[PDB]
Design a protein around this ligand. Structure first.
Ligand code: ZTP
Length: 371
């Protein structure tokens, strides 16, 4: 994967190039490896030495730049998406006078040594091409045991206040912000929280989801409470409900009017996962798996190796047998007085994790994996 570091100044700065600078403001406490490589590239190509004025973060560097407390900053493209949270117009306030491309090695999927594996499902709250960066509002772990034919779905509330791995600097923030750093941040965050290996991920957005539901002929669920979604457009009665793609999207997005709010939304997402699984494991869908891949590969990202898809599909085609699915959700207390690492100037709602819910969730995951 690709990212870049740049030297940025204010849009109307008289500074045109890096040789005109003596210093740059940069978060060398937290992004030093990348920053030094940029500085080394600058020295190599333009024979210019810059001293660093340390900032506490990219956000803080940006604030110094716009306050005129520094003439130039280093920006890391990954963290521009964080800055955008507090400063939506940031891109319009700056120009870049030096740019350096970087690539990070992609952490391979992990093959399980046994009959169990974990797939992390990340749902991105945006329409459009799958490469659009946004927060991860769906965060569901699928723990699958091929031997016992059991699936456990563990949902972690998108507001869950957890140490965010990688770009999150292991500081506590709401889980959903991990999706802005990238799927690897999301993955490592949840591995650390639950003490498990995540073998694979699937990342999709609103547009990806609609495309998938259409392809499968919609989905069928049992709805437990009467509710409506999307400013009253869809009405869902108690009982068996068929959901076409727009209906299904409404079904998984509504929370405010639900008896258990965001918890019930998470349960609705789990119902839809089961319903999707039931369509994906029909004989027709399994036979036609390549067509499904062909039709959805542009809008759904996954690191499940093709080899692995073929094995899972053909094993299921040969064996049959449905998976028994159970669901759980990490519980906690909503608070508005805890600091957000990504948004330190905003009061955000977060969910402080309940220690005993966490223990129960972890033990349930281990139980399914062991058998
Ligand atoms: C694999 C095959 C084909 C076969 C073998 C399968 C087999 C027999 C066995 C193995 C099982 C395996 C390996 C796989 C099963 C298939 C898998 C892994 C997945 C299928 C399910 C899936 C990919 C997705 C379902 C995810 C879902 C419920 C929703 C995603 C859509 C989005 C982005 C919703 C956002 C809604 C929210 C909360 C906020 C936005 O709302 P907003 O931002 O407006 O408001 P807010 O709230 O913020 O205020």
């Amino acid at each position: 994967s690709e990212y870049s570091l740049s030297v940025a100044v204010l849009a109307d700065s008289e500074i045109e190039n890096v040789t005109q600078l003596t210093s740059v403001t940069a978060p060398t406490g937290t992004d030093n490896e990348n920053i030094q490589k940029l500085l080394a590239d600058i020295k190599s190509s333009q024979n210019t030495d810059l001293t660093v004025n340390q900032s506490s973060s990219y956000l803080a560097a940006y604030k110094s730049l716009i306050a005129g407390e520094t003439k130039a900053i280093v920006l890391n493209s990954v963290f521009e998406n964080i800055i955008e949270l507090e400063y939506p117009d940031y891109a319009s306030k700056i120009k870049k006078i030096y740019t350096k491309g970087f690539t990070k090695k992609v952490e391979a999927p992990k093959t399980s040594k046994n009959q169990s594996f974990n797939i992390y499902v990340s749902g991105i709250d945006t329409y459009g091409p799958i490469s659009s960066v946004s927060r991860s509002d769906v965060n569901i772990l699928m723990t699958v045991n091929r031997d016992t034919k059991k699936i456990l779905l563990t949902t972690t509330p998108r507001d869950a206040y957890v140490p965010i791995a990688d770009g999150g600097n292991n500081q506590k923030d709401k889980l959903t912000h991990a999706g802005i750093y990238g799927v690897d941040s999301s993955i490592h965050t949840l591995e650390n929280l639950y003490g498990v290996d995540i073998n694979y991920y699937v990342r999709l957005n609103f547009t990806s989801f609609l495309k998938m539901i259409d392809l499968l002929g919609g989905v069928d669920v049992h709805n437990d409470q009467e509710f409506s979604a999307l400013h009253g457009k869809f009405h869902f009665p108690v009982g068996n409900v068929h959901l076409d793609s727009e209906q299904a999207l409404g079904f998984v997005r509504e929370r405010y009017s639900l008896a258990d709010g965001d918890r019930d939304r998470g349960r609705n997402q789990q119902k839809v996962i089961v319903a999707i699984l039931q369509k994906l494991t029909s004989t027709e869908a399994l036979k036609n798996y390549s067509t499904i891949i062909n039709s959805l590969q542009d809008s759904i990202q996954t690191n499940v190796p093709l080899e692995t898809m073929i094995n899972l599909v053909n094993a299921q085609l040969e064996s049959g047998g449905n998976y028994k699915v159970n669901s759980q959700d990490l519980k906690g207390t909503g608070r508005m007085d805890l600091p957000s690492y990504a948004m330190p100037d905003s009061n955000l709602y977060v969910m402080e994790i309940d220690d005993s819910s966490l223990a129960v969730v972890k033990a349930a995951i281990q139980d399914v994996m062991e058998g």
